[model samples]
Target chain A: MKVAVLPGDGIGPEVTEAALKVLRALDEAEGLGLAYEVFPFGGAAIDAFGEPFPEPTRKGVEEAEAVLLGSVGGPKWDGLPRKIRPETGLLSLRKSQDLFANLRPAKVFPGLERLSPLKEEIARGVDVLIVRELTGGIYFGEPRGMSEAEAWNTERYSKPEVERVARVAFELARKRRKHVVSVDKANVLEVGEFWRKTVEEVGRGYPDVALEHQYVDAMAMHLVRSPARFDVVVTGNIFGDILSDLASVLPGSLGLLPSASLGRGTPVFEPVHGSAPDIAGKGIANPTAAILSAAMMLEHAFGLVELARKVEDAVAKALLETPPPDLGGSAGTEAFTATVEAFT
Target chain B: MKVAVLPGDGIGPEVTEAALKVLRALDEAEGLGLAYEVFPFGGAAIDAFGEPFPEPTRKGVEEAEAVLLGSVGGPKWDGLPRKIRPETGLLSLRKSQDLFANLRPAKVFPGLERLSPLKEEIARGVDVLIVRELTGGIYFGEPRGMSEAEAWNTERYSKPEVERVARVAFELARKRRKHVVSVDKANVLEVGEFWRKTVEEVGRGYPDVALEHQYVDAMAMHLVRSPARFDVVVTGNIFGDILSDLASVLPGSLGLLPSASLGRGTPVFEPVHGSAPDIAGKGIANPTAAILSAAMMLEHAFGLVELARKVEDAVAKALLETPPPDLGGSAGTEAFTATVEAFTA
Candidate 1:
């Protein structure tokens, strides 16, 4: 199978190298068919082709089975126009790939719960899947503009928008906790009513999964109070944007998290950490989140569930001793990868 | 000065009576010169006078210099019609009184930091003032509707709505910590950008107050991560409703927080806790939040800073030992209020 690799600016290339090394070793050991084609994305692509997601990269992603991306953007390209900026390039890819569901999982592995801002006991065993609707919400909804006198935005949601994402939560819940909490502000906003009605309709299909609903504001407090209690949290783009990021820090640091943006087309798996200009070439950058994203790519994109579980097991075993810089570990990126490779 | 007291349903009356006892004691001992006109409000008003905010109550509030309110709404009033509900009556009161800015302070007082859900060190020294735009924005904005296929709510904000509330934060910051963080989703939302620009413009008038901006989502996380970092926070109506409530719980329970809604007319001082029907009339409901709201009325409404400070000091002293039931203390409303009154030394 063909895999598209986009190791864009900053520490992207380094972290991407570690993930590649793991994939190649798995290929050699398990004899799983895998081929790769590297392409420029974000700032690197902007400099090479004058567009962050140049036509060449778009075609490369289309032709490939799946894509593995490293972090993108840095201070060097800070002044780039918004359209050509590394950030915009990534958003365009999501638009192009039709990636509608953004999945963010925040889990504090055993010993690392100490890293969470919450108490060790409170932070322990906190594994939550946040399925956020990416395409529609107040953020992307039109009728959103500002005037000198007034400014406004519409939180628009359609039946289809709510259903697709609700199914994503319920399907994922059926595998994990069998519990799904569809969050919205239906008590006030009319769109929230639409969101709730549709999610309930989709939920009826999966009777094995326990279904519940919570107001967005109340969910904000519950996330802080008992994050462990939540299994799969489904919500609109706006609530998801806030919640995923809020839960990001619960696992100690963003360096330990990986996210998947999936839809009808090819999925884009990437680490939650941004391209760090300061630590780009220092080798101290943590490759844990990158490696984990590869784990997700294998299971979801390639349907290599057995291979993915072992990859995750290696990461967990490596994390027990070798600490990343963010986790106060003395190991560098290569050293961390080597430890993970050894465990595998 | 005249004070309007609206002790609504459930434990509202019980808590309001506790606050009244302390006010009378201060009147006698400190020559505070305070007079009050009590009126039925909320669900109780619905049952008594057929209107939540009766004509007489509205006129009484207009005639008074300030207002002290107990909690409102309970299961008994839950199924009430949209217009006659206990909540609408309070909203109508806020609109009629022209109250535009809502000030919610989530302060984890010393020795009480342990009450915070956050770690003691994290929750300690947390004193955040959330200045929310109460009357404008999405909640009251027009053109909101729903269809089977689509539902939309307009989160619209005017320049003045942002300015007035921004000024409230800057003014309060100068008297307290001299810093304000205006929150919005500026990067994504146009109204967010407009609100940020409007706040920056209002902030220019107060050079003494330091100002900054944060996205609503980022602010949600920061409030959890380092609530102690914020001094005074300003935001639009919807953002405020979510944030103030989110921050309200950081101090452990809502029963320990008080809020002040101020505008051109008399400010309404109310506790953050709602009326608990199950515990109503039992004399065991916590009244600390209600009593603290009275202190805010003295300072913000009457401008009697010294009297307000003394009232605050007494409440702080009382909390040192007498635990309100919400905080695992067995002290009832009257017991806690009496302790607070005795410590007004």
Candidate 2:
């Protein structure tokens, strides 16, 4: 496997390097042939190549079979123009790659439940995977503009567009708890009407998997009231953006969550966190999310379920040893990563 | 003042009758000069007059100076066609009356904090008022329908529509917490663009009140995470529908919540709950929400703030002495209302 890797900024390199160590061990054990080509990107690209997303980085992604991306953003890039801001660079990459589905898992890892803001009874057993349609819906709908007279945006969804994302959710639910909740505002929005009908149509293909529906606004409250009741949730772009970020905090912090964006081509996997400028070279950043991203890439990108399980099992074992910094632990980057390596 | 009363459907007459006793007390004591005319509406009208919003009901509402609508909907009305459903009739009535704003209060009453789904620390002091811009947005926007290919809805807001609602929130806030958090999706939607800009312009007219902005989704989480932090929240129609329902639980149960639909004519006051047909006429249903709706009618439609406070204080006193059955108390509907009446006297 030819992997395009970007150790973009701050703790990006530190955690990406740590994930590489676990991947290397798995490669040796399974005789899995894997090769990585690193490219300068994010703030580093802005500094060394005069752009946040340099041309060389784009070329590198085109040649690779899959990509392993790390967090990007630091105080050093704070004043950069909107064109050169590190976050806008990732937006460009996703658009260029035609990545349409973003899969984010807000799993409550064992032994770290203390960090959760919820009371013990409510916070425990919160393992939800949010499958969000990334490229369509109101966020990108047509005839969107503003005027002094009126401001408007269309919330439109085509059958084919809703079908693909619903299928993705159903397929994932089959591997999980066998329940898919398609959330929309069908009672109000016509786009939601189309979305609900299309998802129910896709449900016929997966009879064993259960299907349910909820309005976007109701689901928001349900998530807080009873999160564990949900197994796999699928929704359009804007709703997903809010629900995903809201659930990320339930597991304690963004440092322990990972995400995947899939398209017709090779998928792009990344940790759902930002570069920690305060602890950059000091090496106290957490690698749990980064390592989990590698596990997702293996399961989805390469169909290496058993191999992915090995990495995930080891990380779970290692996290039980001590909490990561973001979760209020004192362990630095290398000290804890070595523990993860030992278990692997 | 003439009040158009709608004993809508199941549990509708039960709770509204309980509310009427308190209104009668005020009229008897201070010569409040209030007279009510009841009409059959919602599912009851469909059964009696062959229409959910019959001509008799329409004429009654037109003649009255104010309206007090009770809960509507039951399993018997479920099979009705889309056009005649009990809820659609309420929707048509609101549109005909030009009720453009909905005011919902989610105040966590003292001594009932334990009933909240949220933790005590988070749900203890949640006293936020959600002023929702009704009668606009994707729910009512034009170009709304489906095809074999695609379906869509428009989420548009005019400057004046947003401006008028922001003024309502600010004016109400000046009486309460002097803070208004205007919510929208300005980061993504163009309609959010107009909403945010208009609310800011209105804020300039009221320097004493502090104004803030939050995305709709972010506000959803914040409401659960820390509800006490907010005072008066303003948002467009669809978003308000969601946030209001979410906060309804923070105070304990939907049974204690009341709502008002404000417009150019007589406003419609009602509880934010459904008619429980299963428990209808049991005399055990909670009357807290219905009685509070009467209080809102006093404050908004009649401009009788002092009388509104009297009803509110007595209701709060009654809730604390013995929680409603919905909140796990054993007192039935009328028993609770009697306690509230004694306190009002």
Candidate 3:
């Protein structure tokens, strides 16, 4: 499998290196053929080439079977043009890849369960996957931008857009828990009502999956009070952004959760976190999320389920033995990755 | 002070009677010359006079100094025209009154603290006041309705709409802990950005009030994980509906919390709960929310602060002695009201 790797700015390189080491171990142990092609992207690329995402980088990602992106954006390029900013590059890539389905799994690992604010009973067995519509919805909707007098945006959803994402969620739910809780504010926003209706219509095709509807607010409350009740939470872009980050808290640190943005073609896997400009280059960045992201890449893109399981098991083994600082242990990126490599 | 009472529907009358009995005791004890004029409104009115909000009822509320509404909506009225449904009448009255500010306070009374889902430490000081913009935003925005094939709605917010709600939050924050947390989705939505920027501009005017901003999603998480950190939470209508209900969980039962919706005119106070269709005529419904809402009306609208305090104290005292059955206590509605009335005597 050919992998396009974008170890962008800040702690991106640090965590990427740790993840690469673990991925290398997985390849060797499982006898899998994996080739990584690295690219210069994000803020550093923008500083040198005048574009955050260079033409060659985009072309290279298109050629690869899958892509692994490290964290993007930092204070150094804070004043850069929006077109060349880290976020713009990332957004452009997701759109370019047509990666509409974003899967953010929020599961409390045994070692990190104590980090949760919830009681042990509630935190235990709490594993939920938030399937978000990434490329569409309010994020990239028309009439969105800043103006001198005022700022405005629209939360619009077309029938096809809602149908596609709903299909992704229902299909995934069938494979996992056979339950999908579609979240939207159907009682309020027009877009929400469309989202709810589309999900119900598409849900009819999948009789094996049990579907339910919850208002965005109710879902938010449910996510907090009893996270265990949810299995697959499907929503639009903006709600996903908030709920995904909120879901990160259940597993404790945002540093330990990985996410995959998948669609019809190639999928993009990355940590469900951001560049910690404050803790960049501290050699203490938690790389579990990145490594797990690599596992998802192997499974979804390369069709290497066994290799993915090996990578996931290695992470679990490492987490049990040597807890990283984020999870209240002394192990840093290298130490934790080394333990995982040994397990592999 | 004159009180306009709208005992709208099934349990509405039952609960209103319990609340009125308690308020009468407080009024007499404080020597407050208060008069209440009861009027027909909501589903019952729709059945009797073919109008949910009769012209006479609307005029009565307009002339009165303050309005006290019991719970509205019932199963029997479910088949009524959408316009005359209990909620529509309530919404119409809010529009007529132009009540833009809806305050839903979620405070865990001492005895009821055990009902919270969170640990005692996390749930202890969760005295949050959700200041919701009632009239505008997505709830009443343009292009909102359902169709056979699809449904659509708008999440519109003009600058003035955001500004008015901002002022209410800041004023409440200044009075309480002097801290206000403006909730929005500034990172994504244009309305959220407007909401954030407007609040920031509004915050500049109130230098004494500490201000912070949280994305709606993060706020939802914090509401569950650590609710005690907040003092006053101000957000758009759609977000507020969920947060307010979520906040209700802090006190255990949604039946116990009272909400006040205020604009520029006579404020509308009601329980932060819906009409329990299941217990409509069973006489088992808890009337604490309605009773406490009357207390809030006394304080906020009529300037009967002492009477409000008496009503609040009486309810608290009653709960300590014998909590209502809904709250795990053996006391029923009449029993609870009698106990609260005894406090005023």
Pick the DockQ winner.
1
Off by over 4 Å in 1: A305-309
Q: Which candidate leads in TM-score?
A: 1
Model 1 interface DockQ: 0.73
Interface RMSD of 1: 1.3
For candidate 1, the clash count comes to 1
Best by lDDT: 1
Taking all chains together, each candidate's TM-score versus the true structure is: 0.96, 0.91, 0.92
Candidate 3 has which clashing residue pairs, if any? A190-B152, A190-B153, B99-B263, B100-B263
The TM-score of candidate 2 is: 0.91
Better of 1 and 2 by lDDT: 1
- What's the ranking of the predictions by lDDT, best on top? 1, 2, 3
Assess candidate 2 and give its lDDT.
0.85
Clashing pairs in 1: A323-A329
For model 2 chain B, the run of ten residues with the poorest summed lDDT: B110-119
CAPRI classification of candidate 3: acceptable
Tens digits of per-residue lDDT, candidate 1, A1-344, equal 68999999888899988988888889888888899999999899988899999999999999988889999998878897886888999998999989989999998887777677787767888999999999998897778877779998877888888888899899888878899999888888787888888898889899999999998888887887789999999998988988888888788787888889998877898988889878889999888888889988998788898888888888877887888777777889999899888766
Q: Score the docking of each candidate (DockQ).
A: 0.73, 0.57, 0.39
